[PDB]
Design an enzyme around this catalytic site. Structure first.
Site, PDB file in Angstrom:
ATOM      1  N   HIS A  68      -5.951  -5.665  -8.205  1.00  0.00           N
ATOM      2  CA  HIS A  68      -6.080  -6.342  -6.701  1.00  0.00           C
ATOM      3  C   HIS A  68      -7.218  -7.343  -7.028  1.00  0.00           C
ATOM      4  O   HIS A  68      -7.946  -7.109  -6.061  1.00  0.00           O
ATOM      5  CB  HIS A  68      -6.281  -5.276  -5.913  1.00  0.00           C
ATOM      6  CG  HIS A  68      -4.845  -4.312  -5.583  1.00  0.00           C
ATOM      7  ND1 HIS A  68      -4.698  -3.468  -5.982  1.00  0.00           N
ATOM      8  CD2 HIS A  68      -3.708  -4.806  -4.789  1.00  0.00           C
ATOM      9  CE1 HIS A  68      -3.590  -2.796  -5.750  1.00  0.00           C
ATOM     10  NE2 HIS A  68      -2.999  -3.734  -5.018  1.00  0.00           N
ATOM     11  N   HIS A  72      -3.782 -11.741  -8.879  1.00  0.00           N
ATOM     12  CA  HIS A  72      -2.845 -11.040  -8.149  1.00  0.00           C
ATOM     13  C   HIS A  72      -2.555 -12.050  -6.860  1.00  0.00           C
ATOM     14  O   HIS A  72      -1.361 -12.285  -6.700  1.00  0.00           O
ATOM     15  CB  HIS A  72      -3.088  -9.509  -7.751  1.00  0.00           C
ATOM     16  CG  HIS A  72      -2.185  -9.091  -6.816  1.00  0.00           C
ATOM     17  ND1 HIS A  72      -0.842  -9.014  -6.923  1.00  0.00           N
ATOM     18  CD2 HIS A  72      -2.373  -8.534  -5.357  1.00  0.00           C
ATOM     19  CE1 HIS A  72      -0.451  -8.380  -6.022  1.00  0.00           C
ATOM     20  NE2 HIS A  72      -1.274  -8.337  -5.091  1.00  0.00           N
ATOM     21  N   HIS A 106      -3.849 -12.137   0.845  1.00  0.00           N
ATOM     22  CA  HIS A 106      -3.228 -10.752   1.450  1.00  0.00           C
ATOM     23  C   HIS A 106      -4.100  -9.806   1.018  1.00  0.00           C
ATOM     24  O   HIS A 106      -3.798  -8.742   1.365  1.00  0.00           O
ATOM     25  CB  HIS A 106      -1.700 -10.874   1.042  1.00  0.00           C
ATOM     26  CG  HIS A 106      -1.545 -10.322  -0.368  1.00  0.00           C
ATOM     27  ND1 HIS A 106      -1.855 -11.259  -1.422  1.00  0.00           N
ATOM     28  CD2 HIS A 106      -1.103  -9.056  -0.766  1.00  0.00           C
ATOM     29  CE1 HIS A 106      -1.339 -10.434  -2.415  1.00  0.00           C
ATOM     30  NE2 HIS A 106      -1.153  -9.150  -1.904  1.00  0.00           N
ATOM     31  N   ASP A 107      -4.626  -9.922  -0.073  1.00  0.00           N
ATOM     32  CA  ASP A 107      -5.579  -8.438  -0.633  1.00  0.00           C
ATOM     33  C   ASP A 107      -7.184  -9.015  -0.771  1.00  0.00           C
ATOM     34  O   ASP A 107      -7.750  -8.106  -1.565  1.00  0.00           O
ATOM     35  CB  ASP A 107      -5.066  -8.039  -2.078  1.00  0.00           C
ATOM     36  CG  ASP A 107      -3.811  -7.200  -2.094  1.00  0.00           C
ATOM     37  OD1 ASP A 107      -3.630  -6.339  -1.163  1.00  0.00           O
ATOM     38  OD2 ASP A 107      -3.302  -7.167  -2.831  1.00  0.00           O
ATOM     39  N   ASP A 217       4.769  -9.324  -3.267  1.00  0.00           N
ATOM     40  CA  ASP A 217       3.494  -8.769  -3.490  1.00  0.00           C
ATOM     41  C   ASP A 217       4.204  -7.761  -4.611  1.00  0.00           C
ATOM     42  O   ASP A 217       3.075  -7.420  -5.585  1.00  0.00           O
ATOM     43  CB  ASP A 217       3.276  -7.827  -2.306  1.00  0.00           C
ATOM     44  CG  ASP A 217       1.900  -7.307  -2.333  1.00  0.00           C
ATOM     45  OD1 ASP A 217       1.246  -7.438  -3.368  1.00  0.00           O
ATOM     46  OD2 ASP A 217       1.759  -6.138  -1.746  1.00  0.00           O
ATOM     47  N   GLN A 269       8.251   4.899 -13.110  1.00  0.00           N
ATOM     48  CA  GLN A 269       8.623   3.615 -13.048  1.00  0.00           C
ATOM     49  C   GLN A 269       9.966   3.593 -12.388  1.00  0.00           C
ATOM     50  O   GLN A 269      10.404   2.757 -11.638  1.00  0.00           O
ATOM     51  CB  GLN A 269       8.352   2.887 -14.240  1.00  0.00           C
ATOM     52  CG  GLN A 269       6.868   2.404 -14.538  1.00  0.00           C
ATOM     53  CD  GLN A 269       6.605   1.359 -13.419  1.00  0.00           C
ATOM     54  OE1 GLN A 269       6.715   0.269 -13.186  1.00  0.00           O
ATOM     55  NE2 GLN A 269       5.581   1.863 -12.729  1.00  0.00           N
TER      56      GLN A 269
HETATM   57  C1  LIG Z   1       5.061  -1.817 -10.717  1.00  0.00           C
HETATM   58  C2  LIG Z   1       4.512  -0.895  -9.806  1.00  0.00           C
HETATM   59  N1  LIG Z   1       4.593   0.293  -9.895  1.00  0.00           N
HETATM   60  C3  LIG Z   1       4.286   1.140  -8.678  1.00  0.00           C
HETATM   61  O1  LIG Z   1       4.127   2.397  -8.863  1.00  0.00           O
HETATM   62  C4  LIG Z   1       4.749   3.301  -9.623  1.00  0.00           C
HETATM   63  C5  LIG Z   1       5.087   4.723  -9.899  1.00  0.00           C
HETATM   64  N2  LIG Z   1       4.589   5.530 -10.682  1.00  0.00           N
HETATM   65  C6  LIG Z   1       4.832   6.754 -10.328  1.00  0.00           C
HETATM   66  C7  LIG Z   1       4.549   8.008 -11.282  1.00  0.00           C
HETATM   67  C8  LIG Z   1       3.626   7.607 -12.575  1.00  0.00           C
HETATM   68  C9  LIG Z   1       3.074   8.740 -13.563  1.00  0.00           C
HETATM   69  C10 LIG Z   1       3.463   9.914 -13.127  1.00  0.00           C
HETATM   70  C11 LIG Z   1       4.118  10.317 -11.947  1.00  0.00           C
HETATM   71  C12 LIG Z   1       4.531   9.298 -10.991  1.00  0.00           C
HETATM   72  C13 LIG Z   1       5.427   6.863  -9.300  1.00  0.00           C
HETATM   73  N3  LIG Z   1       5.625   5.636  -8.557  1.00  0.00           N
HETATM   74  C14 LIG Z   1       6.386   5.180  -7.257  1.00  0.00           C
HETATM   75  C15 LIG Z   1       3.576   0.507  -7.676  1.00  0.00           C
HETATM   76  N4  LIG Z   1       3.097   0.964  -6.528  1.00  0.00           N
HETATM   77  C16 LIG Z   1       2.764  -0.074  -5.611  1.00  0.00           C
HETATM   78  N5  LIG Z   1       2.939  -1.331  -6.362  1.00  0.00           N
HETATM   79  C17 LIG Z   1       2.782  -2.659  -5.987  1.00  0.00           C
HETATM   80  C18 LIG Z   1       3.438  -1.059  -7.512  1.00  0.00           C
HETATM   81  N6  LIG Z   1       3.975  -1.831  -8.593  1.00  0.00           N
HETATM   82 MG   LIG Z   2      -2.409  -4.943  -0.538  1.00  0.00          MG
HETATM   83 ZN   LIG Z   3      -0.871  -7.249  -3.066  1.00  0.00          ZN
END
Ligand SMILES: Cc1nc(OCc2nc(-c3ccccc3)cn2C)c2ncn(C)c2n1
Ligand SMILES: [Mg+2]
Ligand SMILES: [Zn+2]
Length: 313
Positions: A68, A72, A106-107, A217, A269
């Site tokens: 952030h 970004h 925005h951040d 974003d 992911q």
């Molecule tokens: C690329 C990206 N990935 C995100 O979350 C990935 C994400 N990993 C998990 C997870 C990881 C390891 C173990 C268990 C669960 C859950 N989830 C939703 C983001 N969240 C907000 N932004 C902007 C994001 N951008």
């Molecule tokens: Mg933000």
């Molecule tokens: Zn952002």
């Protein structure tokens, strides 16, 4: 007035594409933003001196956090530039002015921690702003910088145009609170499918700009795979620090934020692409057909995370 920013040929060409990566040369990012304002908006949207001073004050107010950060900010503005350039006639002069600034701001002053972490910590910002805590802060910091002497890039607007652009920015920045995205996209989904979506209805345009803000974003999932993958490391570096700080308050973090559960990242992911990113760009593509390359790039990245899980990388 007669002073263009020009970019080297490769950047002049690639900057127009959704998947452009702004590069590791921080000193070029202000120039890249001004270039984008000039093409998106015009060479007299802003006084160059005031715009340069605004950009550098915004940069100073981004912190040295893994994700952030100032990179970004500029990345998110570039994705907005690409949306606006591929949708020339759909947006007002004010909207084009407001949305690149909103994206850059925005951040502002992000500390690398979620709204949830601030509330659990009992941070003062959580008392001042009970929802969209960081996003109300980011808007507050944008107004603060606009009010510094010599930083009022909107000074040449009429009183009511000024009020309109600060209202565009405020809504655009609040819309980056991902907690608000799910309901916003459901309503746009309903409106598009029952055919009630009307871009002359201001409440509908607000919703569509909100979704554009989510799309810009999240735009790390719309880059070429090596960029997506290396950006994910920066994203998780913050989540895992937040997780550490959750453990310091005696709260087990969610697995996303627990560095002990690095192994589950690829499956996490997939959930993110399937629950957030793909639906985001699908609805965006339904409303604004020329943003389709974002959806196509997101689907390619989903396929790459599927290959990571199958141990093919
Ligand atoms: C690329 C990206 N990935 C995100 O979350 C990935 C994400 N990993 C998990 C997870 C990881 C390891 C173990 C268990 C669960 C859950 N989830 C939703 C983001 N969240 C907000 N932004 C902007 C994001 N951008
Ligand atoms: Mg933000
Ligand atoms: Zn952002």
């Amino acid at each position: 007035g007669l002073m263009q920013f020009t970019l080297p040929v490769r950047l002049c060409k690639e900057i127009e594409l959704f998947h452009f990566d702004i590069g590791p040369f921080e000193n070029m990012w202000p120039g890249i933003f001004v270039y984008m304002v000039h093409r998106s908006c015009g060479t007299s949207c802003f006084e160059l001196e005031k715009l340069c001073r605004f950009i550098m004050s915004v940069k100073k107010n981004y912190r040295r956090v893994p994700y952030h950060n100032w990179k970004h900010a500029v990345t998110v503005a570039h994705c907005m530039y690409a949306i606006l350039q591929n949708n020339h006639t759909l947006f007002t002069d004010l909207e084009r002015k407001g949305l690149l600034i909103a994206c850059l701001c925005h951040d502002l002053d992000h500390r690398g921690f979620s709204n949830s972490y601030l509330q659990k910590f009992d941070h003062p910002l959580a008392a001042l702003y009970s929802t969209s805590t960081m996003e109300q802060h980011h808007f507050s910091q944008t107004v603060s910088i606009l009010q510094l002497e010599g930083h009022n890039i909107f000074s040449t607007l009429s009183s009511s145009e000024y009020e309109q652009v600060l209202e565009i920015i405020r809504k655009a920045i609040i819309a980056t609170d991902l907690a608000l995205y799910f309901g916003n996209r459901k309503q746009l989904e309903e409106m598009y499918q029952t055919g009630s979506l009307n871009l002359n209805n201001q409440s509908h345009r607000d919703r569509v700009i909100g979704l554009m803000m989510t799309a810009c974003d999240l735009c790390s999932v719309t880059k070429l795979w090596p960029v997506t993958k290396l950006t994910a490391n920066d994203i998780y570096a913050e989540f895992w620090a937040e997780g550490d700080e959750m453990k310091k308050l005696g709260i087990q973090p969610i697995p996303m934020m627990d560095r002990d559960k690095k192994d589950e990242v690829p499956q996490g992911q997939l959930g993110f692409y399937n629950a957030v990113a793909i639906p985001c760009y699908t609805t965006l593509t339904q409303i604004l057909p020329p943003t389709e390359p974002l959806l196509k790039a997101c689907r390619d990245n989903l396929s790459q995370w599927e290959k990571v899980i199958r141990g093919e990388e």
